[PDB]
Amino acid sequence: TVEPYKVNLSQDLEHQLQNVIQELNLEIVPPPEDPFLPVVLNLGKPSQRQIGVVPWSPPQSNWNPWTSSNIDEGPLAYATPEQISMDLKNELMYQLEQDHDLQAILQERELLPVKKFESEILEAISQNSVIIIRGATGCGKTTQVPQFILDDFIQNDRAAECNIVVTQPRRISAVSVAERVAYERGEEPGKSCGYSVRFESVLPRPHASIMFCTVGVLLRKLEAGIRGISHVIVDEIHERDINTDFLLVVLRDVVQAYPEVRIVLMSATIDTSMFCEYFFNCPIIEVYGRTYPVQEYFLEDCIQMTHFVPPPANCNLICGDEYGPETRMSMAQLNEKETPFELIEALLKYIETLNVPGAVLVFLPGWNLIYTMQKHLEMNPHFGSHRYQILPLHSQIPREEQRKVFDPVPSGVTKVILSTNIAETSITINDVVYVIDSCKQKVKLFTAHNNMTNYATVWASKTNLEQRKGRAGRVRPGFCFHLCSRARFERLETHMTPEMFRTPLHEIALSIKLLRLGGIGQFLAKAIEPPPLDAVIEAEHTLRELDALDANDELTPLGRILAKLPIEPRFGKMMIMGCIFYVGDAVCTISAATCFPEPFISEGKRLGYVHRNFAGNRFSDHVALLSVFQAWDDARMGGEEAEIRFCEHKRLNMATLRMTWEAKVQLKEILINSGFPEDCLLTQVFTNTGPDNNLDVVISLLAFGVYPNVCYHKEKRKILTTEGRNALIHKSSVNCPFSSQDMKYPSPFFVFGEKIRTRAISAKGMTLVTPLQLLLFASKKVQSDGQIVLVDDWIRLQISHEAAACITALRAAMEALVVEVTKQPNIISQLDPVNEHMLNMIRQISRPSAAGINLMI
């Protein structure tokens, strides 16, 4: 157990709290008659009910479908479709006529398996409202089909009547495919091709254009409707991305009401009968090309071929008699929960002895096991520049480094790709003869009850291993090396659990309400495979708690704002609260930074003197974050090269800071348009060492945003979670003790970003908060016996009943103000003296000094 923490609160402040509560006429819960029966201090403190179909209209010559606005300037404002159609045709005919590098690219395009199905695909699309283009990965579904459709309208003098939307499940795919199709038309993105992912877009031209966006972005732009679009291409439907599954529900209603629209669903070689039945038994256009017979090998075959020996229910124990005693004895020593890196090294050295030039595609879960495998290889001098080109391929690296996987290598060098499941069905790498398959997947499991994020390394499906096996037989007779026992393969599920089954639904719930599609549960019931009940109940509960929905489950003015903001609704509300306190910029910066990896280059180690200094004396990763932005935004003043020098010298990832800043500008814009004043979102300079009340309030609002992630510090890295369970301070934290010197925290309480479950519970991105900040924002339920208070039945404080119930009343007073503010956001300019008195009182108890703490000593 742990003793109740004493909160040394001054007599002056305890009166001020009581005064404000009295001035606001707040119904404070009085003390208990006796101990043993404690009282809850929590103060509990609508629109008419409505199904609806998202409206549709075809392309128009004086309309820009991407900016969702009229063209009332330039030549295209008055110009007729016939002129635009001829102007765009003549331009393309002349380009193909001249550019010899473009002619060569078109000659590569015309060799892709999909090419010979061009006639049938175009014929199918023209006849039917919806079709499915099923076909193996590498035929050219993604890159060619949109072009075929566009060219067919250009060549047949109807370029003005074509505007294609193409949805991709991943961010990287939307941007990469746009860059790829642009190159294939001898352009950069911004002409015939463009992309619109989250916090980054390059808009294409208003006519005869393709938009490669993510589904999340499309849904956020449907508020007006699908106006000025001829075709909607939903790509990679087989991956079962939750937002894609959701869009198919929307699009089916759209097809039914507006059958003139054209929907093209594109899928790998899977059972597409589910989607066919869903879209009124639509046609399935089959696409195929040359494939070679790939030899399948499992963990037994690999260990035996390489004569491998590991260092110092389990399916590695189960092994057939048709194998060797040492093979069976060797395999048995391998832990299934880890990937054998030394075996992959042994498999690469075996691939050499076969004397058949070809690239090796190594499938791994995430950026960690790719980083680990890469580091492991470069240690051995054999896997050097002269003999091996080892290229990593995951989401969070520059596109320059990702483009290099397609580049040919000089003969004598082997191209080894250490990739995630991006290279499973989403992209095809050429000259791939060998595939080393870990047989694992990285999925984000989230259990709401304990607020546990688990980036788990779970088993892949049979369908996954069959698709990964097929990545070898596109050049010549290939080999696939599965690192799973022949027993384990039998125990694998046929298909991966679709995201709809195992993902929070509150972001989708808001989308449903914004687009006015009716009831959350009513709409999600129409899904191709509806989500489980508790996930819909959990979503409806989450949005009610935030006052995003009311008792009638109808969207509130607050809920409308949260829907438009593309971040966690809890961070969206934290930003709204931030605006009220005139710290809107800082909270927008913090909110943005959650969407990107850490700007620090720590390399999975403890932080150095340089990175730790950004934290100041606040014992906060979030203060460190805000501080690198202050330092970075100051360094940018001296041009681009000075920015690159600052980043290199301070070991910072420049691409991360730029994308995060860009995101902050876009979040800020959505608040401005929602009615919030300009001068409550200004970049206010701050100190991370000296007294700063604006930073005090940011950390108070942080506590709200990351709730229910709070923890208690015991000794060294060992911390106590909200479940009363043991957890660790993450190595990458500033609050992680460097070497043996134990940190003297002025408070044991920490709010934090993610509650990562691995071997043990690891709290990442930690910020120290006072016990007053704990009671104000980082708690829901509070019970008092008169002397002790019980915060969410996990930790106890020794604080005056009066102060604890008053701090609990401010929380309710703030919620009430947030509701009033969201009805008319411009009221934060001039507030009632009474409202500013409770804001000033929150500002007061946000201070360290308020809890008798001086961070400078």
Ligand SMILES: Nc1ncnc2c1ncn2[C@@H]1O[C@H](COP(=O)(O)OP(=O)(O)O)[C@@H](O)[C@H]1O
């Ligand atoms: N960035 C790229 N660099 C080189 N080749 C590429 C690139 N993107 C796609 N390709 C090639 O284009 C062809 C079609 O790919 P794609 O349209 O993604 O196929 P799919 O039908 O599987 O979606 C493949 O041969 C692939 O190797």
Ligand SMILES: CS(=O)(=O)Nc1cccc(NC(=O)c2cc(-c3ccccc3)cs2)c1
């Ligand atoms: C609604 S639709 O489905 O018919 N068309 C559609 C589809 C997908 C995406 C977008 N639009 C965008 O992605 C973006 C637009 C702007 C923008 C807007 C105004 C001024 C300046 C920039 C930035 S991103 C439209």
Ligand SMILES: [Mg+2]
């Ligand atoms: Mg594809």
